[PDB]
Amino acid sequence: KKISQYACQRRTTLNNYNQLFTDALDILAENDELRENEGSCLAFMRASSVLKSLPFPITSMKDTEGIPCLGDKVKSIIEGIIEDGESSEAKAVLNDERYKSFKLFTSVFGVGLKTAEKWFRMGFRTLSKIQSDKSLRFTQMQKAGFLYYEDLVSCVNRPEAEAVSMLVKEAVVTFLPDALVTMTGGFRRGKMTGHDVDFLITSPEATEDEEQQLLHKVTDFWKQQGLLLYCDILESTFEKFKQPSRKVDALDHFQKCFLILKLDHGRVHSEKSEGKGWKAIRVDLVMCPYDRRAFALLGWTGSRQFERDLRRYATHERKMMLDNHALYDRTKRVFLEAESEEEIFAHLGLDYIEPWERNA
Ligand SMILES: [Mg+2]
Numbered sequence: 317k318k319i320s321q322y323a324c325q326r327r328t329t330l331n332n333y334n335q336l337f338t339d340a341l342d343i344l345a346e347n348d349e350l351r352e353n354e355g356s357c358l359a360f361m362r363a364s365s366v367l368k369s370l371p372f373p374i375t376s377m378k379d380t381e382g383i384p385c386l387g388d389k390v391k392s393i394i395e396g397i398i399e400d401g402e403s404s405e406a407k408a409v410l411n412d413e414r415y416k417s418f419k420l421f422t423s424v425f426g427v428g429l430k431t432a433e434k435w436f437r438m439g440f441r442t443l444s445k446i447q448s449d450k451s452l453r454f455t456q457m458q459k460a461g462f463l464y465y466e467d468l469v470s471c472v473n474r475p476e477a478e479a480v481s482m483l484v485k486e487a488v489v490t491f492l493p494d495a496l497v498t499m500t501g502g503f504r505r506g507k508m509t510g511h512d513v514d515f516l517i518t519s520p521e522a523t524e525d526e527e528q529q530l531l532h533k534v535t536d537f538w539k540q541q542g543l544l545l546y547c548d549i550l551e552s553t554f555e556k557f558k559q560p561s562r563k564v565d566a567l568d569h570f571q572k573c574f575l576i577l578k579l580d581h582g583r584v585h586s587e588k589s590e591g592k593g594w595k596a597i598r599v600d601l602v603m604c605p606y607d608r609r610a611f612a613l614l615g616w617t618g619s620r621q622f623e624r625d626l627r628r629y630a631t632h633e634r635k636m637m638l639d640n641h642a643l644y645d646r647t648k649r650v651f652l653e654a655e656s657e658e659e660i661f662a663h664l665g666l667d668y669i670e671p672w673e674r675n676a
């Protein structure tokens with residue numbers, strides 16, 4: 317049939333037949349993001365997203381006809397890939413100093429764009445010069461980022477993700493035996509590796525008081541045992557009767573905590589049977605009211621592009637407003653309920669897309 321411009325109306329599995337085009341596009345998009353060039357960035361991400369969706373590899377400019385999200389700027393890039401087999405534009409970004417530095421400083425936990433720019437403009441070009449400079453000052457988060465840099469740069473496996481899962485369940489079960497813990501993000505979509513492990517937590521019979529304290533308890537608990545290397549808890553900013561905004565910002569979120577846990581090797585059951593029997597792992601935990609679990613899961617399952625298109629689809633095609641906490645129908649003036657992701661898709665009039673099919 318016809319290919320939708322919306323990723324939420326496309327099935328995108330991990331079988332990418334267009335990695336050559338896709339990698340160059342991701343690099344160009346990333347470059348624009350690091351430069352805060354919104355428009356260009358999103359254009360590159362949309363184009364890369366549609367190609368990942370293809371069931372065949374592009375081998376001529378003709379195979380492009382009919383596909384949306386491919387402007388003249390992008391087709392020029394597709395063109396070069398068809399020929400050389402590589403992109404001179406992507407190549408240029410990979411050798412760009414600002415790009416190299418930002419990506420490097422940014423690979424440090426706690427280092428955002430403002431901090432990266434600062435260091436770049438001071439002349440810094442390597443992590444070593446940064447760490448040894450006896451004049452710079454770092455946030456608590458950045459210190460932790462440097463302290464465990466090595467483990468954090470190392471991808472996280474499914475085996476490690478599952479061991480982390482077990483830890484979370486053992487803790488959470490201790491304060492809410494009826495708590496539901498779901499692994500979200502990349503791993504839920506079937507990925508083999510990730511830079512961190514995310515989880516959604518909810519309790520059927522928890523009180524507004526209980527669900528609000530669980531994370532503090534679980535984290536305290538890990539502190540007592542020395543498993544907590546870094547912890548930051550942000551209180552929920554979601555309001556029960558407030559409808560999702562025009563995406564004004566993402567300051568709307570449930571209670572969550574950015575953590576770094578000490579993962580003992582002995583708890584990891586992989587086909588790899590030492591030195592320092594543990595590994596630091598980035599872990600994000602999210603707690604939400606039982607009745608909003610479907611929306612949170614949908615939101616945290618990603619991918620980012622899938623989440624972006626789900627939202628604009630809802631707004632531009634169905635006059636609905638979507639959030640990690642709700643779905644509002646502006647036409648019928650009512651909030652729509654959902655006990656599962658499928659119901660949410662039904663409400664939007666969208667055929668259900670499985671998690672492993674959301675790698676847009
Ligand atoms: Mg995360």
Ligand code: NA
Nearest residue numbers: 422424425427
């Ligand atoms: Na970072």
